[PDB]
Design an enzyme around this catalytic site. Structure first.
Site, PDB file in Angstrom:
ATOM      1  N   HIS A   1     -32.730  -3.831 -34.518  1.00  0.00           N
ATOM      2  CA  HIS A   1     -33.247  -2.839 -35.499  1.00  0.00           C
ATOM      3  C   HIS A   1     -33.545  -1.502 -34.800  1.00  0.00           C
ATOM      4  O   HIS A   1     -33.226  -0.447 -35.397  1.00  0.00           O
ATOM      5  CB  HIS A   1     -34.467  -3.395 -36.246  1.00  0.00           C
ATOM      6  CG  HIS A   1     -34.885  -2.530 -37.385  1.00  0.00           C
ATOM      7  ND1 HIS A   1     -36.129  -1.931 -37.446  1.00  0.00           N
ATOM      8  CD2 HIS A   1     -34.214  -2.133 -38.488  1.00  0.00           C
ATOM      9  CE1 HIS A   1     -36.215  -1.216 -38.549  1.00  0.00           C
ATOM     10  NE2 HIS A   1     -35.055  -1.325 -39.208  1.00  0.00           N
TER      11      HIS A   1
ATOM     12  N   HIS B   1     -44.092   0.278 -45.783  1.00  0.00           N
ATOM     13  CA  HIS B   1     -43.358   1.323 -46.545  1.00  0.00           C
ATOM     14  C   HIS B   1     -44.009   1.565 -47.904  1.00  0.00           C
ATOM     15  O   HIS B   1     -43.988   0.661 -48.743  1.00  0.00           O
ATOM     16  CB  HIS B   1     -41.881   0.956 -46.654  1.00  0.00           C
ATOM     17  CG  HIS B   1     -41.218   0.797 -45.324  1.00  0.00           C
ATOM     18  ND1 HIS B   1     -40.994   1.866 -44.467  1.00  0.00           N
ATOM     19  CD2 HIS B   1     -40.725  -0.295 -44.699  1.00  0.00           C
ATOM     20  CE1 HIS B   1     -40.392   1.434 -43.374  1.00  0.00           C
ATOM     21  NE2 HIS B   1     -40.216   0.111 -43.491  1.00  0.00           N
TER      22      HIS B   1
ATOM     23  N   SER C   1     -30.939   5.008 -44.185  1.00  0.00           N
ATOM     24  CA  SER C   1     -31.291   5.270 -42.763  1.00  0.00           C
ATOM     25  C   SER C   1     -31.159   6.764 -42.419  1.00  0.00           C
ATOM     26  O   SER C   1     -30.034   7.325 -42.508  1.00  0.00           O
ATOM     27  CB  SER C   1     -30.461   4.423 -41.838  1.00  0.00           C
ATOM     28  OG  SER C   1     -29.086   4.749 -41.967  1.00  0.00           O
TER      29      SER C   1
ATOM     30  N   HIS D   1     -34.330  -4.339 -51.005  1.00  0.00           N
ATOM     31  CA  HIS D   1     -33.211  -5.130 -50.432  1.00  0.00           C
ATOM     32  C   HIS D   1     -33.349  -6.614 -50.793  1.00  0.00           C
ATOM     33  O   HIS D   1     -34.484  -7.126 -50.806  1.00  0.00           O
ATOM     34  CB  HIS D   1     -33.168  -4.954 -48.916  1.00  0.00           C
ATOM     35  CG  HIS D   1     -33.202  -3.546 -48.426  1.00  0.00           C
ATOM     36  ND1 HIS D   1     -34.378  -2.919 -48.073  1.00  0.00           N
ATOM     37  CD2 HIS D   1     -32.210  -2.671 -48.154  1.00  0.00           C
ATOM     38  CE1 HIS D   1     -34.115  -1.703 -47.642  1.00  0.00           C
ATOM     39  NE2 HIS D   1     -32.788  -1.530 -47.674  1.00  0.00           N
TER      40      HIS D   1
ATOM     41  N   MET E   1     -26.558  -3.967 -45.905  1.00  0.00           N
ATOM     42  CA  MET E   1     -27.367  -4.969 -46.643  1.00  0.00           C
ATOM     43  C   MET E   1     -27.935  -4.357 -47.920  1.00  0.00           C
ATOM     44  O   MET E   1     -29.009  -4.811 -48.362  1.00  0.00           O
ATOM     45  CB  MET E   1     -28.513  -5.469 -45.763  1.00  0.00           C
ATOM     46  CG  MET E   1     -28.042  -6.050 -44.455  1.00  0.00           C
ATOM     47  SD  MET E   1     -29.401  -6.776 -43.527  1.00  0.00           S
ATOM     48  CE  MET E   1     -28.473  -7.763 -42.355  1.00  0.00           C
ATOM     49  N   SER E   2     -27.215  -3.414 -48.523  1.00  0.00           N
ATOM     50  CA  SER E   2     -27.742  -2.622 -49.658  1.00  0.00           C
ATOM     51  C   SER E   2     -26.625  -2.003 -50.495  1.00  0.00           C
ATOM     52  O   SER E   2     -25.474  -2.415 -50.351  1.00  0.00           O
ATOM     53  CB  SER E   2     -28.601  -1.548 -49.112  1.00  0.00           C
ATOM     54  OG  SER E   2     -27.769  -0.528 -48.596  1.00  0.00           O
TER      55      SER E   2
ATOM     56  N   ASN F   1     -24.281   1.085 -35.349  1.00  0.00           N
ATOM     57  CA  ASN F   1     -23.909   0.200 -34.210  1.00  0.00           C
ATOM     58  C   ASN F   1     -22.484  -0.338 -34.387  1.00  0.00           C
ATOM     59  O   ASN F   1     -21.964  -0.297 -35.522  1.00  0.00           O
ATOM     60  CB  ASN F   1     -24.905  -0.955 -34.071  1.00  0.00           C
ATOM     61  CG  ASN F   1     -24.905  -1.892 -35.262  1.00  0.00           C
ATOM     62  OD1 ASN F   1     -25.940  -2.432 -35.643  1.00  0.00           O
ATOM     63  ND2 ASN F   1     -23.751  -2.115 -35.857  1.00  0.00           N
TER      64      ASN F   1
ATOM     65  N   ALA G   1     -27.313   2.638 -43.690  1.00  0.00           N
ATOM     66  CA  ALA G   1     -26.836   2.237 -42.349  1.00  0.00           C
ATOM     67  C   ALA G   1     -25.783   1.146 -42.521  1.00  0.00           C
ATOM     68  O   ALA G   1     -25.680   0.573 -43.616  1.00  0.00           O
ATOM     69  CB  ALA G   1     -27.956   1.765 -41.456  1.00  0.00           C
TER      70      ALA G   1
ATOM     71  N   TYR H   1     -32.873  -9.091 -48.839  1.00  0.00           N
ATOM     72  CA  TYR H   1     -33.573  -9.770 -47.717  1.00  0.00           C
ATOM     73  C   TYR H   1     -35.090  -9.714 -47.929  1.00  0.00           C
ATOM     74  O   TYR H   1     -35.735 -10.673 -47.533  1.00  0.00           O
ATOM     75  CB  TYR H   1     -33.157  -9.252 -46.338  1.00  0.00           C
ATOM     76  CG  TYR H   1     -33.459  -7.812 -46.016  1.00  0.00           C
ATOM     77  CD1 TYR H   1     -34.747  -7.370 -45.755  1.00  0.00           C
ATOM     78  CD2 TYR H   1     -32.428  -6.898 -45.898  1.00  0.00           C
ATOM     79  CE1 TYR H   1     -35.004  -6.050 -45.419  1.00  0.00           C
ATOM     80  CE2 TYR H   1     -32.666  -5.577 -45.561  1.00  0.00           C
ATOM     81  CZ  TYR H   1     -33.959  -5.146 -45.321  1.00  0.00           C
ATOM     82  OH  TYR H   1     -34.171  -3.832 -45.002  1.00  0.00           O
ATOM     83  N   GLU H   2     -35.638  -8.679 -48.571  1.00  0.00           N
ATOM     84  CA  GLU H   2     -37.111  -8.569 -48.793  1.00  0.00           C
ATOM     85  C   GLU H   2     -37.578  -9.605 -49.830  1.00  0.00           C
ATOM     86  O   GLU H   2     -38.793  -9.844 -49.910  1.00  0.00           O
ATOM     87  CB  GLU H   2     -37.511  -7.160 -49.233  1.00  0.00           C
ATOM     88  CG  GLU H   2     -37.523  -6.135 -48.115  1.00  0.00           C
ATOM     89  CD  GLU H   2     -37.510  -4.700 -48.620  1.00  0.00           C
ATOM     90  OE1 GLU H   2     -36.432  -4.232 -49.026  1.00  0.00           O
ATOM     91  OE2 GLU H   2     -38.582  -4.062 -48.634  1.00  0.00           O
TER      92      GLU H   2
HETATM   93  C1  LIG Z   1     -30.646  -5.700 -39.656  1.00  0.00           C
HETATM   94  O1  LIG Z   1     -31.285  -4.427 -39.629  1.00  0.00           O
HETATM   95  C2  LIG Z   1     -30.998  -3.594 -40.667  1.00  0.00           C
HETATM   96  C3  LIG Z   1     -32.009  -3.106 -41.482  1.00  0.00           C
HETATM   97  C4  LIG Z   1     -31.696  -2.280 -42.540  1.00  0.00           C
HETATM   98  C5  LIG Z   1     -30.362  -1.945 -42.809  1.00  0.00           C
HETATM   99  C6  LIG Z   1     -30.019  -1.070 -43.930  1.00  0.00           C
HETATM  100  C7  LIG Z   1     -30.830  -0.518 -44.812  1.00  0.00           C
HETATM  101  P1  LIG Z   1     -30.176   0.710 -45.850  1.00  0.00           P
HETATM  102  O2  LIG Z   1     -29.926   1.952 -45.050  1.00  0.00           O
HETATM  103  O3  LIG Z   1     -28.891   0.236 -46.456  1.00  0.00           O
HETATM  104  O4  LIG Z   1     -31.115   1.047 -46.961  1.00  0.00           O
HETATM  105  C8  LIG Z   1     -29.345  -2.455 -41.996  1.00  0.00           C
HETATM  106  S1  LIG Z   1     -27.644  -2.052 -42.302  1.00  0.00           S
HETATM  107  C9  LIG Z   1     -26.876  -2.504 -40.804  1.00  0.00           C
HETATM  108  C10 LIG Z   1     -26.822  -1.759 -39.652  1.00  0.00           C
HETATM  109  N1  LIG Z   1     -26.141  -2.472 -38.716  1.00  0.00           N
HETATM  110  C11 LIG Z   1     -25.769  -3.677 -39.253  1.00  0.00           C
HETATM  111  C12 LIG Z   1     -25.053  -4.787 -38.730  1.00  0.00           C
HETATM  112  O5  LIG Z   1     -24.588  -4.903 -37.591  1.00  0.00           O
HETATM  113  N2  LIG Z   1     -24.912  -5.801 -39.670  1.00  0.00           N
HETATM  114  C13 LIG Z   1     -25.380  -5.757 -40.927  1.00  0.00           C
HETATM  115  N3  LIG Z   1     -26.037  -4.752 -41.413  1.00  0.00           N
HETATM  116  C14 LIG Z   1     -26.236  -3.698 -40.571  1.00  0.00           C
HETATM  117  C15 LIG Z   1     -29.677  -3.283 -40.932  1.00  0.00           C
END
Ligand SMILES: COc1ccc(/C=C/P(=O)(O)O)c(Sc2c[nH]c3c(=O)[nH]cnc23)c1
Ligand SMILES: COc1ccc(/C=C/P(=O)(O)O)c(Sc2c[nH]c3c(=O)[nH]cnc23)c1
Ligand SMILES: COc1ccc(/C=C/P(=O)(O)O)c(Sc2c[nH]c3c(=O)[nH]cnc23)c1
Ligand SMILES: [Cl-]
Ligand SMILES: [Cl-]
Ligand SMILES: [Cl-]
Ligand SMILES: [Cl-]
Ligand SMILES: [Cl-]
Ligand SMILES: [Cl-]
Ligand SMILES: [Cl-]
Ligand SMILES: [Cl-]
Ligand SMILES: [Cl-]
EC number: 2.4.2.1
Lengths: 282, 282, 282
Positions: A255, A62, A31, A84, A217-218, A241, A114, A86-87
């Site tokens: 998101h 993407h 992120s 990921h 999630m990564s 967040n 993130a 989830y994908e």
């Molecule tokens: C649900 O939306 C997303 C989409 C993508 C990512 C990460 C992608 P990366 O940067 O690792 O490649 C996240 S990570 C994330 C932030 N806040 C939370 C939360 O509250 N719970 C659980 N997970 C996250 C969340």
């Protein structure tokens, strides 16, 4: 796993064939490190599609690209676009790139991501050094080393108690003071969850009670195969967040607020990573 | 997931073709709501087999049937027969029905289920309103949104902190007093486990310590895709048993005691659900 | 699951055809019970490969062998070589042998295994009687009964609160005093994790907090299908190591230290198991 060693070798060699860049450091950009490729001097871009055996996202949004170049006088290969659970990708695809990096002779992995804050002392825009992870999927079988072990990458049963380099993390606290940031660089434990749905409150309470400071999630699968290959590993999270931890709040995670916190912290993150290259042992 | 949007549309349309019933409320009938179809005025029954793309149980015992009709002057579609992980169904099959319901323009899902008591204040025959869930399978990858996201159902990253409607739950405490039941309607957190084996004691202690009030083997995947589609969600559990939490007891959990508690609570549950239709916003 | 009942029957019958040994007790030999086959009087060895429908390890290192014979005047079938999630085997393959044992009319399963100490009172070389397990994979769907249930093996929803026989465990504390060992036989809860990577510190803290005394990567699936078949079950762990529970330590877990603790405890373990046959009800 539908990849042989010959497959990994083919991808490594093809990249060596098609660039004069011999990188030491791989960075997986999470992120708000989108634009970190703008700071590579002497950039050579590959689309994942061109790169052989390289997973390509089905999703139209993407177009993942691999970029070779120099950042702060360090030979780097950057990943802009990540895979990921989830994908729908299996972990032998999520972590495919790391095994290739090693075969390019990259010795150091930087992983960014993130994450939601579970530690109450955390605030949006904060940066948390990953000191440890809790691999919740791994417990249930979803570990990227599951299957036959190849001696040419590493041991059947690698340790992880030391996954996140102690030295890099000290040298990262120092760089923070030099950046003169208003807010103290945080340190904590990242729990991976598969998603893609956000946590419930009962769920957020489970993760805090398990000892997690952030949830994302990564990263974790990448860290495990990096450490399996003998790579030094450093990582941090952008606190996008604060995970809703009570029923009285009338606030849903989203998101948009993650994209936002990511655009807002881009400059700061891009700076921190490029200064950090200097502290990366040669 | 071996289902396209065209597949979901085909099933919805085929049902619209083959009944004049336009339902607002879907009810998934768990333990001891078998006979709730006897209270539908103007009932039209489909066997799952007739319904296209509709998963059908291999097991000889249960011939799942979908029934359209009116309950307490509410247009309802009821599911008598449910799909569980333990049976071997993937979650894109378990939750297939919910996506169809939405395409019928159903706006509200009622979910019922059996569960073991983990909260000691709970007793057999008790009814626990689901306020929150802990999705233990989801953490490890077994979430029904895993894969490509279709914008036509909802967002890639839906929130769940609010999954169980606050209003429905208040309006359900009120209806209880009107029923004049001897025992207070309970409220709590439902942890899903895949089963099919019952919990150990160490396991029961893990689930109580994670903050769970009841443990069952269903519902959560349905709630997640319902909330992904924008459906209002209300659910409760029949407390079929008290999860053995000590080694000194000489008592094993058993399916018979679950069937029993289910036959014993049928009348009470059938009443509560039909009065509840009145409190369902139109 | 790619095995029918006819398949299990075929394997059982083929073994009955090819030996006069009618065994009562099956022993699955974990860390440092390699040489326990040297103590079988009247040994008849099968390589897994010869045995029909019997999973065979792809890995060159281990040629798993099934051995029929008598130990301390008990008819035993021993498994030298085991199947683990981390190797890539699905659980219907890991636990295939147990269903065959039952069809040979074996009534008792002994399960041994290595494990890291999570209880601080534990020391390397210690022996922990398994009183209970925590099946972390099972929670997420990875239970070996997942799929259609065959009535000819057992009930769709078996209990596990009683999996580890109380009597066997008392009769095992008695035998210890007769062995006159310097160190007290331990008793505790074994958490299964899929591996194959060793735990992080945050991870070790999660498992201790969940109430686990030892962590290993086997046994639990075998115990669940054994109890599903009505087999009496007794098991212990060799405490091969103390799980690193702090960041201040400069010590990584390793396979070598597990092989070591296993060679070091072989004699003691081989003795304990053979004396134990006497306390096995006929
Ligand atoms: C649900 O939306 C997303 C989409 C993508 C990512 C990460 C992608 P990366 O940067 O690792 O490649 C996240 S990570 C994330 C932030 N806040 C939370 C939360 O509250 N719970 C659980 N997970 C996250 C969340
Ligand atoms: C093991 O036997 C069954 C079979 C079916 C169900 C639920 C079906 P649903 O009504 O959701 O459609 C349950 S739920 C359940 C009651 N007590 C326990 C318990 O002690 N542990 C864990 N789960 C349960 C248990
Ligand atoms: C990682 O290396 C291995 C390889 C094999 C086994 C067990 C095989 P079995 O005897 O059950 O047939 C173990 S078990 C084990 C000892 N210490 C630990 C630890 O610290 N964590 C988690 N698990 C283990 C560990
Ligand atoms: Cl492709
Ligand atoms: Cl997958
Ligand atoms: Cl997978
Ligand atoms: Cl079919
Ligand atoms: Cl499946
Ligand atoms: Cl599946
Ligand atoms: Cl084969
Ligand atoms: Cl598998
Ligand atoms: Cl599997």
């Amino acid at each position: 796993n539908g990849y042989t060693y010959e497959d990994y070798k083919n991808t490594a060699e093809w990249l060596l064939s098609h660039t004069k860049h011999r990188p030491q450091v791989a960075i997986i950009c999470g992120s708000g490190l989108g634009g970190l490729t703008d700071k590579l001097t002497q950039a050579q871009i590959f689309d994942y599609g061109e790169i052989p055996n390289f997973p390509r996202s089905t999703v139209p949004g993407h177009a993942g690209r691999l970029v070779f170049g120099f950042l702060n006088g360090r030979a780097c290969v950057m990943m802009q676009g990540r895979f990921h659970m989830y994908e729908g990708y299996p972990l032998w695809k999520v972590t495919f790139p790391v095994r290739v990096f090693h075969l390019l002779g990259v010795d150091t992995l930087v992983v960014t991501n993130a994450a939601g804050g579970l530690n109450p002392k955390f605030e949006v825009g904060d940066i948390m050094l990953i000191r440890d992870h809790i691999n919740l999927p791994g417990f249930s079988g979803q570990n990227p080393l599951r299957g036959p072990n190849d001696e040419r990458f590493g041991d059947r049963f690698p340790a992880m108690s030391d996954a996140y380099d102690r030295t890099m993390r000290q040298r990262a606290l120092s760089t923070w003071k030099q950046m003169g940031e208003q807010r103290e660089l945080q340190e904590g434990t990242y729990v991976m969850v598969a998603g893609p749905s956000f946590e419930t409150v009962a769920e957020c309470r489970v993760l805090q009670k398990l000892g997690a400071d952030a949830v994302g999630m990564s990263t974790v699968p990448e860290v495990i195969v990096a450490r399996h290959c003998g790579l030094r590993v450093f990582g941090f999270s952008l606190i996008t967040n604060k995970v809703i931890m009570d029923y009285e709040s009338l606030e849903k995670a989203n998101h948009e607020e993650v994209l936002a916190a990511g655009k807002q912290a881009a400059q700061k993150l891009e700076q921190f990573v490029s200064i950090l290259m200097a502290s990366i042992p040669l």
